[PDB]
Amino acid sequence: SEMTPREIVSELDKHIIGQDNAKRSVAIALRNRWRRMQLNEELRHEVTPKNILMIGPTGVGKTEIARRLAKLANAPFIKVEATKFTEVGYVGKEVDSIIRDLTDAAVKMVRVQAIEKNRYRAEELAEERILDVLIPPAKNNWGQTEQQQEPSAARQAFRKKLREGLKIKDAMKLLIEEEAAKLVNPEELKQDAIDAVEQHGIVFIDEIDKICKRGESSGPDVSREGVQRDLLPLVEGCTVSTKHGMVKTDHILFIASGAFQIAKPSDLIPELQGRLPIRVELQALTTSDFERILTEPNASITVQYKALMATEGVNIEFTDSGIKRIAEAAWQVNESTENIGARRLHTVLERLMEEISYDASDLSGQNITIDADYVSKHLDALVADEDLSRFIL
Amino acid sequence: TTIVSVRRNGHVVIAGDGQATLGNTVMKGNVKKVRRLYNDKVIAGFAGGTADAFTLFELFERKLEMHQGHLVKAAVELAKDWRTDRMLRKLEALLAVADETASLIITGNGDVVQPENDLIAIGSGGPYAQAAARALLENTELSAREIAEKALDIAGDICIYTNHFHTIEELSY
């Protein structure tokens, strides 16, 4: 009973501005996992994940999309840097670690997910334990079978006087971390995460393009291509040995990501190209994109900042122009200096608010309003001065 | 020395002389400047170290190995290693290799050149060879082997560093 591609793209729109094709692309991958389960034993085997290769510049959404996709599917997700493994020509690390690290996080998941899908009940039963110490009220039998049956009476009033009111509280917590455990089955819990990894696992491989070629030198290309080679099994379907069991990569979804300015997807080794059936480009963001990113995402950094200041009893308000002026700032620095995509909004925005963020606790009760003026007052100088930019923004 | 490759119709050849010189004296007169490589699929010639070639032809044949057999690619991949590695970079020699597809020249300067009409003429006599190989290919119906050979003898006549000992290889397709 999964959502349709359009529905998936929609949820995604709630967090990422633009980059529609990449959404649709990552959307079809998800939907297909549903589509697979909907088949006959035979086909369920032959149908493999339609892995994706994202091509685009820095900080324009690649990872976020992968991360939000995984969240939407509640799938264990892991991000890994391809070049990491080229270091193996010294010591480095082995690629199987990706599936292992994936499993660890896939466990940390099932756990915290479970400990939570239980903490409530474990708290009620906890009461019946404490409430039991104060009074075993009722029991089998003890009084009337109807009117005199129900023991609650006193117990109830006792209960309330407790919830709202050794150490009952101290004791309960010890009972919470005693009843919750006695309710969790660590065996099915361990196999829990494994099913996840195998059925929904998502591996994001950044820098895949930094592992290609160029007649640069014999030694470096060999190591580079080595990581691709060592990546085949994970992508073609294999078995990895995990601290919590053995996992079949066969259905893990893979989203490889590359800028590909120096090297091209065609330079990738053949057995990998064939395992990256979907290719998608992501566009560089525009100042407009920045403005939207600043405020549209339903948990945008601007919405985030608002909340934090509210925590201090300070009402922050951003002006449209202020927002535009901020976006402009970030863009200018990216062009005047080094282009780092939307990441720059965070630095700029954050520098813009330093003074308020510090004084907030004292401004308690005021109505601060970040407007075009305020922005220019705080950023222009920095922006203008390039050298300063490289250190401060 | 003088190596001359010609390609006409379904034939392409590489002919070379056999003189090896030292100072002003002839060291050897029957040096084998041409040979077959990659399961006789590739024919090559060398101007220079009778061993440096050995090392080179093999590595080249190592390129054609896991590169399907794309003559051009494996050729540029060789000059690449050639101009880099201190080992390879050390040896000097002119390489002339052909094949069904196309013939070209490889040098230490990591250079991969393909003359006009796949006509190659390296070595101290290359110019003479070419001038004659031209006059023929231009005004004659003679085969790739007849021109390469006749052009090679003409060179030997003019070049003090080339003799009339031939070593020819051919490729038909």
Coordinates of C-alpha atoms in Angstrom, one line a residue:
Chain A
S1 CA 0.0 0.0 0.0
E2 CA 2.8 2.4 -1.0
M3 CA 2.5 5.9 -2.5
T4 CA 2.6 6.5 -6.2
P5 CA 5.5 8.3 -7.9
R6 CA 3.6 11.6 -8.0
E7 CA 2.8 11.2 -4.3
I8 CA 6.5 10.5 -3.6
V9 CA 7.6 13.4 -5.7
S10 CA 5.1 15.5 -3.7
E11 CA 6.4 14.5 -0.3
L12 CA 9.8 15.3 -1.7
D13 CA 8.7 18.7 -2.8
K14 CA 8.0 19.4 0.9
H15 CA 11.7 19.5 1.4
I16 CA 13.7 20.0 -1.8
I17 CA 13.3 22.9 -4.1
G18 CA 13.4 22.2 -7.8
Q19 CA 15.5 19.3 -9.1
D20 CA 12.2 17.7 -10.3
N21 CA 13.8 15.1 -12.6
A22 CA 16.0 13.8 -9.9
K23 CA 12.8 13.4 -7.8
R24 CA 10.9 11.6 -10.4
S25 CA 13.9 9.4 -10.9
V26 CA 14.4 8.5 -7.3
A27 CA 10.6 8.2 -7.1
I28 CA 10.4 5.5 -9.7
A29 CA 13.0 3.5 -7.9
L30 CA 10.9 3.4 -4.7
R31 CA 7.6 2.6 -6.5
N32 CA 9.4 -0.3 -8.2
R33 CA 10.2 -1.9 -4.9
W34 CA 6.5 -2.0 -4.3
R35 CA 6.0 -3.2 -7.9
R36 CA 8.4 -6.0 -7.3
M37 CA 6.6 -7.4 -4.2
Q38 CA 3.5 -7.5 -6.4
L39 CA 4.9 -10.3 -8.6
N40 CA 5.3 -14.1 -8.8
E41 CA 8.1 -15.9 -7.0
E42 CA 10.0 -16.3 -10.3
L43 CA 10.1 -12.7 -11.4
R44 CA 10.7 -11.4 -7.8
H45 CA 14.1 -12.9 -8.2
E46 CA 15.0 -11.5 -11.7
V47 CA 13.8 -8.0 -11.0
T48 CA 16.8 -6.0 -9.5
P49 CA 16.9 -2.5 -8.2
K50 CA 17.0 0.2 -10.8
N51 CA 20.0 2.0 -9.4
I52 CA 20.5 5.7 -10.1
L53 CA 23.4 7.9 -11.0
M54 CA 23.0 11.6 -10.1
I55 CA 25.1 14.1 -12.2
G56 CA 25.3 17.6 -10.9
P57 CA 27.3 20.3 -9.0
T58 CA 27.8 20.6 -5.3
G59 CA 25.0 21.3 -2.8
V60 CA 22.1 21.5 -5.2
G61 CA 20.1 18.6 -3.6
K62 CA 21.7 15.3 -4.6
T63 CA 22.1 13.9 -1.0
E64 CA 19.0 15.6 0.4
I65 CA 16.9 13.9 -2.1
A66 CA 18.5 10.5 -1.2
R67 CA 18.1 11.2 2.5
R68 CA 14.4 12.4 2.2
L69 CA 13.6 9.5 -0.1
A70 CA 15.0 7.0 2.5
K71 CA 13.1 8.8 5.3
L72 CA 9.9 8.7 3.3
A73 CA 10.3 4.9 2.9
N74 CA 11.6 4.6 6.5
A75 CA 14.5 2.8 4.8
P76 CA 17.9 2.4 6.5
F77 CA 20.1 4.9 4.7
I78 CA 23.9 5.3 4.6
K79 CA 26.2 7.8 2.8
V80 CA 29.7 6.9 1.7
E81 CA 32.6 8.6 0.0
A82 CA 33.9 6.6 -3.0
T83 CA 37.5 7.9 -2.8
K84 CA 37.6 6.6 0.8
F85 CA 38.5 3.2 -0.7
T86 CA 41.3 4.4 -3.0
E87 CA 43.3 4.8 0.2
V88 CA 43.3 0.9 0.5
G89 CA 46.4 1.0 -1.6
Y90 CA 48.0 2.1 1.7
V91 CA 45.6 0.7 4.2
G92 CA 42.3 2.3 3.5
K93 CA 39.3 0.1 4.3
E94 CA 37.3 -2.5 2.4
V95 CA 34.0 -1.7 0.6
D96 CA 32.1 -4.5 2.3
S97 CA 32.2 -2.1 5.3
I98 CA 29.5 -0.1 3.4
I99 CA 27.0 -3.0 3.9
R100 CA 28.3 -3.5 7.4
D101 CA 28.1 0.1 8.4
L102 CA 24.7 0.1 6.8
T103 CA 23.5 -2.7 9.0
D104 CA 24.8 -1.1 12.1
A105 CA 22.8 2.0 11.4
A106 CA 19.9 -0.2 10.3
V107 CA 20.1 -1.7 13.8
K108 CA 20.5 1.6 15.7
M109 CA 17.2 2.1 13.8
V110 CA 15.1 -0.9 14.5
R111 CA 16.2 -0.5 18.1
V112 CA 15.4 3.2 18.8
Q113 CA 12.3 2.6 16.6
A114 CA 11.2 -0.3 18.8
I115 CA 12.3 1.0 22.2
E116 CA 9.9 3.8 21.1
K117 CA 7.1 1.7 19.8
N118 CA 7.1 0.3 23.4
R119 CA 8.2 3.1 25.8
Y120 CA 4.5 4.0 26.2
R121 CA 3.0 0.6 27.1
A122 CA 6.1 -0.1 29.3
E123 CA 5.1 3.0 31.2
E124 CA 1.5 1.9 31.8
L125 CA 2.5 -1.6 33.0
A126 CA 5.0 0.3 35.1
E127 CA 2.1 2.0 36.8
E128 CA 0.4 -1.3 37.6
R129 CA 3.6 -2.2 39.2
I130 CA 3.9 0.8 41.5
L131 CA 0.1 1.0 41.9
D132 CA 0.4 -2.7 43.0
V133 CA 2.9 -1.7 45.8
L134 CA 0.6 0.9 47.2
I135 CA -2.3 -1.4 47.0
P136 CA -3.0 -4.8 45.5
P137 CA -6.6 -3.6 45.2
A138 CA -9.1 -6.1 43.6
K139 CA -7.9 -9.5 42.8
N140 CA -9.4 -12.8 42.0
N141 CA -12.1 -12.3 43.7
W142 CA -11.9 -10.5 47.1
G143 CA -15.3 -8.8 47.3
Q144 CA -18.5 -8.6 45.2
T145 CA -18.5 -10.0 41.7
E146 CA -20.1 -6.8 40.2
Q147 CA -20.4 -3.6 42.4
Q148 CA -17.8 -4.7 45.0
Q149 CA -15.7 -6.4 42.3
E150 CA -13.9 -3.4 40.7
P151 CA -10.9 -2.5 43.0
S152 CA -10.0 0.6 41.1
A153 CA -11.9 3.0 43.5
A154 CA -9.0 3.7 45.9
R155 CA -6.4 2.5 43.5
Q156 CA -7.6 5.0 40.8
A157 CA -7.4 8.0 43.1
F158 CA -4.1 6.6 44.2
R159 CA -3.0 6.3 40.6
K160 CA -3.8 9.9 39.7
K161 CA -2.3 11.3 42.9
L162 CA 0.9 9.5 41.6
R163 CA 1.0 10.3 37.9
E164 CA 0.5 14.0 38.6
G165 CA 2.3 14.1 41.9
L166 CA 13.5 4.0 46.0
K167 CA 11.6 7.1 45.0
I168 CA 8.4 6.4 43.1
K169 CA 9.7 8.4 40.2
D170 CA 13.3 7.0 40.6
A171 CA 11.9 3.5 40.9
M172 CA 9.6 3.7 37.9
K173 CA 12.4 4.6 35.5
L174 CA 14.3 1.6 36.8
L175 CA 11.1 -0.3 36.1
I176 CA 10.7 1.3 32.7
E177 CA 14.2 0.1 31.7
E178 CA 13.2 -3.3 33.2
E179 CA 9.7 -3.8 31.7
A180 CA 10.6 -2.4 28.2
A181 CA 13.5 -4.9 27.9
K182 CA 11.4 -7.8 29.2
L183 CA 9.1 -6.9 26.4
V184 CA 11.7 -6.7 23.5
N185 CA 12.9 -9.8 21.8
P186 CA 16.6 -9.2 20.9
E187 CA 16.5 -12.1 18.4
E188 CA 13.7 -10.8 16.2
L189 CA 15.2 -7.4 16.8
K190 CA 18.5 -8.4 15.3
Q191 CA 16.9 -10.1 12.3
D192 CA 14.6 -7.1 12.1
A193 CA 17.3 -4.7 10.8
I194 CA 18.6 -7.4 8.5
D195 CA 15.3 -7.8 6.7
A196 CA 15.3 -4.0 6.4
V197 CA 18.8 -3.7 5.0
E198 CA 18.0 -6.4 2.5
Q199 CA 14.5 -5.2 1.5
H200 CA 14.9 -1.4 1.7
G201 CA 18.5 -0.6 2.2
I202 CA 19.7 2.5 0.4
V203 CA 23.4 3.3 -0.2
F204 CA 24.4 6.7 -1.4
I205 CA 27.9 6.8 -3.0
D206 CA 29.2 10.3 -3.4
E207 CA 32.2 11.1 -5.6
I208 CA 31.8 8.1 -7.9
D209 CA 33.4 10.4 -10.5
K210 CA 36.6 10.7 -8.5
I211 CA 37.1 7.0 -9.2
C212 CA 37.2 7.0 -13.0
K213 CA 40.3 7.5 -15.1
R214 CA 42.2 10.0 -17.2
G215 CA 45.6 9.1 -18.7
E216 CA 46.9 10.8 -15.5
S217 CA 49.1 7.9 -14.3
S218 CA 49.1 4.1 -14.2
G219 CA 49.3 3.8 -10.4
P220 CA 46.4 6.2 -9.5
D221 CA 43.9 4.9 -12.1
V222 CA 44.5 1.3 -10.9
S223 CA 43.6 2.2 -7.3
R224 CA 40.7 4.3 -8.5
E225 CA 39.2 1.6 -10.8
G226 CA 39.9 -0.8 -7.9
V227 CA 37.1 0.8 -5.9
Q228 CA 34.8 0.4 -8.8
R229 CA 35.8 -3.2 -9.2
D230 CA 35.3 -3.8 -5.5
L231 CA 31.9 -2.2 -5.8
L232 CA 30.5 -4.7 -8.4
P233 CA 29.6 -7.5 -6.1
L234 CA 27.6 -5.1 -3.8
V235 CA 25.8 -3.8 -6.9
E236 CA 25.5 -7.1 -8.9
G237 CA 24.3 -8.9 -5.9
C238 CA 26.4 -10.7 -3.2
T239 CA 26.6 -11.7 0.4
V240 CA 28.4 -9.7 3.1
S241 CA 29.4 -10.9 6.6
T242 CA 27.8 -8.7 9.3
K243 CA 28.4 -8.4 13.0
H244 CA 24.7 -9.1 13.4
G245 CA 24.3 -11.7 10.6
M246 CA 24.8 -12.1 6.9
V247 CA 23.2 -9.7 4.4
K248 CA 22.2 -10.0 0.7
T249 CA 23.0 -6.7 -1.1
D250 CA 20.9 -8.0 -4.0
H251 CA 18.0 -5.6 -3.3
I252 CA 19.7 -2.6 -1.7
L253 CA 19.1 0.5 -3.8
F254 CA 22.1 2.4 -4.9
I255 CA 22.2 6.1 -5.8
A256 CA 25.7 7.0 -7.1
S257 CA 26.4 10.7 -7.2
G258 CA 29.0 12.5 -9.4
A259 CA 29.7 16.1 -10.6
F260 CA 31.4 14.6 -13.7
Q261 CA 33.1 17.8 -14.8
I262 CA 36.6 16.2 -15.3
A263 CA 35.4 12.6 -16.0
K264 CA 32.3 11.2 -17.7
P265 CA 29.9 8.4 -16.7
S266 CA 31.1 6.6 -19.9
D267 CA 34.6 6.4 -18.2
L268 CA 33.1 4.3 -15.4
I269 CA 33.8 0.6 -15.7
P270 CA 31.3 -1.3 -18.0
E271 CA 30.0 -3.6 -15.3
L272 CA 29.1 -0.6 -13.2
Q273 CA 27.6 1.4 -16.0
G274 CA 25.2 -1.5 -16.6
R275 CA 24.2 -1.3 -13.0
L276 CA 23.4 2.4 -13.1
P277 CA 20.4 2.1 -15.6
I278 CA 19.1 5.5 -14.5
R279 CA 21.1 8.6 -15.2
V280 CA 19.8 12.0 -14.0
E281 CA 21.1 15.6 -14.0
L282 CA 20.6 18.2 -11.3
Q283 CA 20.8 21.9 -12.0
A284 CA 22.8 24.6 -10.4
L285 CA 20.6 26.7 -8.1
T286 CA 19.6 30.3 -8.9
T287 CA 19.2 33.2 -6.5
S288 CA 15.5 32.5 -6.9
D289 CA 16.1 28.9 -5.8
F290 CA 17.9 30.3 -2.8
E291 CA 15.1 32.6 -1.7
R292 CA 12.7 29.6 -1.9
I293 CA 15.1 27.3 -0.1
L294 CA 15.4 30.0 2.6
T295 CA 11.7 29.9 3.4
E296 CA 9.6 27.2 1.5
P297 CA 10.9 23.9 2.9
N298 CA 8.5 23.0 5.7
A299 CA 11.3 23.1 8.1
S300 CA 13.4 25.7 6.3
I301 CA 16.4 27.2 8.1
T302 CA 14.4 30.3 8.4
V303 CA 11.5 28.5 10.1
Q304 CA 14.1 26.8 12.2
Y305 CA 15.7 30.0 13.4
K306 CA 12.3 31.5 14.1
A307 CA 11.6 28.6 16.5
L308 CA 14.9 28.8 18.3
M309 CA 14.4 32.5 18.9
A310 CA 10.8 31.8 20.2
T311 CA 12.4 29.4 22.6
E312 CA 13.9 32.6 24.0
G313 CA 10.6 34.4 23.9
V314 CA 11.6 36.5 20.9
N315 CA 9.5 36.9 17.8
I316 CA 11.6 37.0 14.6
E317 CA 10.1 38.0 11.3
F318 CA 11.8 37.9 7.9
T319 CA 10.9 40.4 5.3
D320 CA 10.6 39.2 1.7
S321 CA 13.3 41.7 0.6
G322 CA 15.4 40.7 3.6
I323 CA 15.1 37.1 2.3
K324 CA 16.0 38.2 -1.2
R325 CA 18.9 40.3 0.1
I326 CA 20.1 37.2 2.0
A327 CA 19.9 34.9 -1.0
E328 CA 21.7 37.5 -3.1
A329 CA 24.5 37.6 -0.4
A330 CA 25.0 33.9 -0.6
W331 CA 25.0 33.9 -4.4
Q332 CA 27.5 36.7 -4.7
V333 CA 30.0 35.0 -2.3
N334 CA 29.6 31.8 -4.2
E335 CA 30.5 33.6 -7.4
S336 CA 33.0 36.1 -6.1
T337 CA 34.8 33.3 -4.3
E338 CA 34.2 29.5 -4.3
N339 CA 30.7 28.1 -5.3
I340 CA 29.5 25.7 -2.7
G341 CA 25.8 25.7 -3.6
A342 CA 22.9 26.1 -1.1
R343 CA 25.3 25.3 1.8
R344 CA 26.3 28.9 1.7
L345 CA 22.8 30.0 2.8
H346 CA 23.5 28.4 6.2
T347 CA 26.8 30.3 6.8
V348 CA 25.4 33.6 5.6
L349 CA 22.1 33.3 7.5
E350 CA 24.0 32.2 10.5
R351 CA 26.4 35.2 10.4
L352 CA 23.4 37.5 9.8
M353 CA 21.9 36.4 13.1
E354 CA 24.9 36.1 15.4
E355 CA 24.2 39.3 17.3
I356 CA 20.5 38.5 17.7
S357 CA 21.2 34.8 18.6
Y358 CA 23.4 36.0 21.4
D359 CA 21.2 38.9 22.7
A360 CA 18.0 36.9 22.2
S361 CA 17.8 35.9 25.9
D362 CA 17.7 39.6 26.8
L363 CA 15.4 40.7 24.0
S364 CA 12.8 38.4 25.5
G365 CA 9.4 39.8 24.7
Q366 CA 10.4 41.9 21.7
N367 CA 9.5 41.9 18.1
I368 CA 12.6 41.7 16.0
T369 CA 12.1 42.2 12.3
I370 CA 14.9 41.2 10.0
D371 CA 14.5 43.4 6.9
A372 CA 16.4 44.4 3.8
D373 CA 18.1 47.1 5.8
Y374 CA 19.2 44.9 8.6
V375 CA 20.6 42.4 6.2
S376 CA 22.6 44.9 4.2
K377 CA 23.7 46.4 7.4
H378 CA 25.2 43.1 8.6
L379 CA 26.4 41.5 5.4
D380 CA 27.4 43.8 2.6
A381 CA 30.8 44.7 4.1
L382 CA 31.7 41.0 4.5
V383 CA 30.3 40.1 1.1
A384 CA 32.2 42.9 -0.6
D385 CA 35.5 42.1 1.0
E386 CA 36.6 38.9 -0.8
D387 CA 39.5 37.8 1.4
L388 CA 37.3 38.3 4.5
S389 CA 34.7 36.2 2.7
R390 CA 36.9 33.2 2.4
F391 CA 37.3 33.1 6.2
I392 CA 34.0 34.4 7.5
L393 CA 31.5 33.1 5.0
Chain B
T1 CA 67.7 2.8 -41.1
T2 CA 64.4 3.1 -43.1
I3 CA 61.0 1.7 -42.4
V4 CA 58.2 2.2 -45.0
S5 CA 54.6 1.2 -44.5
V6 CA 52.0 1.4 -47.3
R7 CA 48.4 0.5 -47.6
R8 CA 46.6 -0.2 -50.8
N9 CA 43.4 -2.1 -51.4
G10 CA 43.1 -5.0 -48.9
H11 CA 46.8 -5.0 -48.2
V12 CA 49.0 -3.0 -45.8
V13 CA 52.7 -3.6 -45.3
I14 CA 55.7 -2.5 -43.3
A15 CA 59.2 -3.0 -44.8
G16 CA 62.5 -2.1 -43.3
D17 CA 66.2 -2.4 -44.2
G18 CA 68.8 -4.5 -42.3
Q19 CA 71.7 -2.1 -41.7
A20 CA 72.7 -1.2 -38.2
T21 CA 75.4 1.4 -38.0
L22 CA 78.0 2.5 -35.4
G23 CA 80.1 5.5 -36.2
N24 CA 80.9 5.2 -39.9
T25 CA 81.0 1.4 -39.9
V26 CA 78.3 -1.1 -40.4
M27 CA 77.8 -3.3 -37.3
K28 CA 75.3 -5.7 -38.7
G29 CA 73.7 -5.9 -42.2
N30 CA 70.8 -8.2 -41.6
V31 CA 69.0 -6.7 -38.7
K32 CA 65.3 -7.7 -38.6
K33 CA 63.5 -4.3 -38.3
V34 CA 60.0 -5.7 -38.9
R35 CA 57.9 -8.3 -37.1
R36 CA 54.4 -9.6 -36.3
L37 CA 52.6 -9.1 -33.0
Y38 CA 49.3 -9.9 -31.3
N39 CA 48.7 -13.3 -32.9
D40 CA 50.0 -12.1 -36.3
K41 CA 47.1 -9.6 -36.4
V42 CA 49.4 -6.7 -36.0
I43 CA 52.5 -5.9 -38.0
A44 CA 55.2 -3.5 -36.7
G45 CA 58.5 -2.0 -37.5
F46 CA 61.1 -0.2 -35.4
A47 CA 63.9 2.3 -36.0
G48 CA 66.5 2.0 -33.2
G49 CA 67.4 -0.3 -30.3
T50 CA 67.0 -3.9 -31.5
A51 CA 66.0 -4.6 -27.9
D52 CA 64.4 -1.4 -26.9
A53 CA 61.9 -2.4 -29.6
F54 CA 61.5 -5.8 -28.0
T55 CA 60.5 -4.2 -24.7
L56 CA 58.2 -1.8 -26.5
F57 CA 56.5 -4.2 -29.0
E58 CA 55.6 -6.4 -26.0
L59 CA 54.1 -3.7 -23.9
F60 CA 52.2 -2.5 -26.9
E61 CA 51.0 -6.0 -27.4
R62 CA 50.0 -5.8 -23.7
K63 CA 47.9 -2.8 -24.6
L64 CA 46.1 -4.6 -27.4
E65 CA 45.5 -7.3 -24.8
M66 CA 42.8 -5.9 -22.6
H67 CA 41.6 -3.0 -24.8
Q68 CA 39.8 -5.4 -27.2
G69 CA 42.4 -4.8 -29.9
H70 CA 41.7 -1.2 -30.8
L71 CA 45.0 -0.4 -32.5
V72 CA 44.6 3.4 -32.0
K73 CA 43.6 3.3 -28.3
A74 CA 46.3 0.8 -27.3
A75 CA 48.8 2.9 -29.3
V76 CA 48.0 6.1 -27.4
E77 CA 48.0 4.2 -24.1
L78 CA 51.5 2.9 -25.0
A79 CA 53.0 6.3 -25.8
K80 CA 51.4 7.3 -22.5
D81 CA 53.4 4.7 -20.5
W82 CA 56.3 5.3 -22.8
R83 CA 56.6 9.0 -22.1
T84 CA 56.0 8.5 -18.4
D85 CA 57.8 5.6 -16.7
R86 CA 61.5 6.3 -16.2
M87 CA 62.1 2.8 -17.5
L88 CA 60.3 3.3 -20.8
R89 CA 61.2 7.0 -21.0
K90 CA 64.8 5.9 -21.0
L91 CA 64.7 4.0 -24.3
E92 CA 64.6 5.8 -27.7
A93 CA 63.2 4.4 -30.9
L94 CA 60.7 5.1 -33.7
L95 CA 57.7 2.8 -33.8
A96 CA 55.6 2.1 -36.9
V97 CA 52.6 -0.2 -36.4
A98 CA 49.8 -1.1 -38.8
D99 CA 46.7 -3.4 -38.9
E100 CA 43.5 -4.1 -40.9
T101 CA 42.1 -0.9 -39.4
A102 CA 44.9 1.7 -39.8
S103 CA 48.6 2.3 -39.6
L104 CA 50.3 4.9 -37.5
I105 CA 53.6 6.1 -35.9
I106 CA 54.4 6.0 -32.2
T107 CA 57.2 8.0 -30.6
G108 CA 58.9 8.5 -27.2
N109 CA 57.4 12.0 -27.1
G110 CA 54.1 10.3 -26.3
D111 CA 53.1 11.1 -29.9
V112 CA 50.6 9.1 -32.0
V113 CA 50.7 10.2 -35.6
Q114 CA 48.8 8.8 -38.6
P115 CA 50.4 10.0 -41.9
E116 CA 48.2 11.1 -44.8
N117 CA 47.3 8.0 -46.7
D118 CA 48.4 5.6 -44.0
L119 CA 51.9 6.0 -45.6
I120 CA 54.7 5.8 -43.1
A121 CA 58.4 6.5 -43.7
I122 CA 60.6 6.7 -40.6
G123 CA 64.3 6.3 -40.0
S124 CA 67.2 8.3 -41.6
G125 CA 65.8 7.3 -45.0
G126 CA 62.1 7.9 -44.4
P127 CA 62.0 11.0 -46.6
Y128 CA 63.5 9.3 -49.6
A129 CA 61.3 6.3 -49.1
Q130 CA 58.2 8.5 -48.9
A131 CA 59.2 10.7 -51.9
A132 CA 59.4 7.5 -53.9
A133 CA 56.5 5.8 -52.3
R134 CA 54.5 8.8 -53.3
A135 CA 55.5 9.1 -56.9
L136 CA 54.3 5.5 -57.2
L137 CA 51.1 5.5 -55.2
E138 CA 50.4 8.6 -57.2
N139 CA 51.1 7.5 -60.7
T140 CA 51.0 3.7 -60.5
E141 CA 48.7 0.7 -59.9
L142 CA 51.5 -1.2 -58.0
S143 CA 50.5 -3.2 -54.9
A144 CA 51.2 -2.1 -51.3
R145 CA 54.1 -4.5 -51.3
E146 CA 55.5 -3.5 -54.6
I147 CA 55.7 0.2 -53.6
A148 CA 56.9 -0.3 -50.1
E149 CA 59.7 -2.5 -51.5
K150 CA 60.6 -0.4 -54.5
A151 CA 60.4 2.8 -52.3
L152 CA 62.6 1.0 -49.7
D153 CA 65.3 0.2 -52.3
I154 CA 65.3 3.8 -53.6
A155 CA 66.0 5.0 -50.0
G156 CA 68.8 2.4 -49.5
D157 CA 70.4 3.9 -52.6
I158 CA 70.4 7.5 -51.3
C159 CA 70.8 6.9 -47.6
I160 CA 74.2 6.1 -46.4
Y161 CA 72.6 4.6 -43.3
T162 CA 70.4 2.1 -45.0
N163 CA 71.1 -1.2 -46.9
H164 CA 69.2 -3.3 -49.3
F165 CA 68.4 -6.1 -46.9
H166 CA 64.6 -6.2 -46.6
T167 CA 62.2 -7.7 -44.0
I168 CA 58.6 -7.3 -45.1
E169 CA 55.4 -8.2 -43.4
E170 CA 51.9 -8.0 -44.8
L171 CA 48.2 -8.0 -43.8
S172 CA 45.3 -9.0 -46.0
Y173 CA 41.6 -8.2 -45.4

